[PDB]
A paper describes a structure:
EccD1mt (Rv3877) is a 54 kDa protein containing an ~110 amino acid (aa) N-terminal ubiquitin-like domain followed by a 30 aa linker and 11 closely spaced transmembrane helices at its C-terminus. We grew crystals of the predicted cytoplasmic domain of EccD1 from M. tuberculosis (cyto-EccD1mt) which diffracted to 1.88 Å. We subsequently solved the 1.88 Å cyto-EccD1mt structure by molecular replacement using the EccD1mt segment of the MBP fusion protein. In both structures EccD1mt residues 20–109 adopt an identical ubiquitin-like fold characterized by a β grasp motif and an anti-parallel β sheet with strands in the order 2,1,5,3,4. Interestingly, the asymmetric unit of both crystal forms contains two EccD1 molecules and in both crystal forms the two EccD1 molecules are arranged as a head-to-tail homodimer stabilized by an extensive interface. The interface is formed by interlocking side chains from β strands 1 and 2 and the N-terminal α-helix of both EccD1 molecules and ~650 Å2 of each EccD1 molecule (13 % of the total surface) is buried in the interface as calculated with the PISA webserver. The interaction is stabilized by 4 hydrogen bonds and a cluster of buried hydrophobic residues including Met1, Val54, and Val58 resulting in a solvation energy of −13.9 kcal/mol and a Complex Significance Score of 1.0 calculated by the PISA server. Dimerization of cyto-EccD1mt creates a wide open-ended groove bordered on two sides by the α1/β3 loops. Notably, the dimerization interface brings acidic residues (Glu45, Asp49, Asp50, Glu57, Glu60, and Asp61) from both chains into this groove. The negatively charged groove of the EccD1 dimer indicates that it should associate with a positively charged partner(s).
Numbering used by the authors:
A (entry chain A), B (entry chain B): 20 to 109
């Protein structure tokens, strides 16, 4: 399985992940959010810039400050390269 | 976020995955199965040894031939190390 290294920015915190490169983002985004919520459960809120893992609505990846990537596309389709910064948006 | 590379056995096929080592298995197993479903979607049926992605219960990881690991535990809790062989069972 091809993979890509991405770093998720949550406020000031960076978290490095290894994600499937060629599978649509919709296939794994929900459990990604769930994992990151556990990983950052003890992190102070001011450091997370108030980030809410319990936000309602449809989660997607986005390059910081940009419109969200299409969930039916893979990271490869979206041109995401190793070490790219992404955010989680809903 | 700690990770451990595991080898998932499906029939005669072995597929390496980098999984979160420190969060409960139940946090990511469902999307792991979904991802693996896409990755192995062109694998010939005889290589798959009757492995079925259609669940007969709640999915769990298991060391081949052993009782399934508890979903509330992490890979670390289960003593899983790099290149540990695991299967998916329901």
């Amino acid at each position: 399985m091809a993979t890509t290294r991405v770093t998720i920015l949550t406020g000031r915190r960076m978290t490095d992940l290894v994600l499937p490169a060629a599978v649509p983002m919709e296939t794994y985004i929900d459990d990604t959010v769930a994992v990151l919520s556990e990983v950052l459960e003890d992190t102070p809120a001011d450091v997370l810039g108030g980030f809410d893992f319990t936000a309602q609505g449809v989660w997607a990846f986005a390059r910081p400050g940009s419109p969200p990537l299409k969930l039916d596309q893979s990271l490869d389709d979206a041109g995401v390269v190793d070490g790219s910064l992404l955010t989680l948006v809903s």
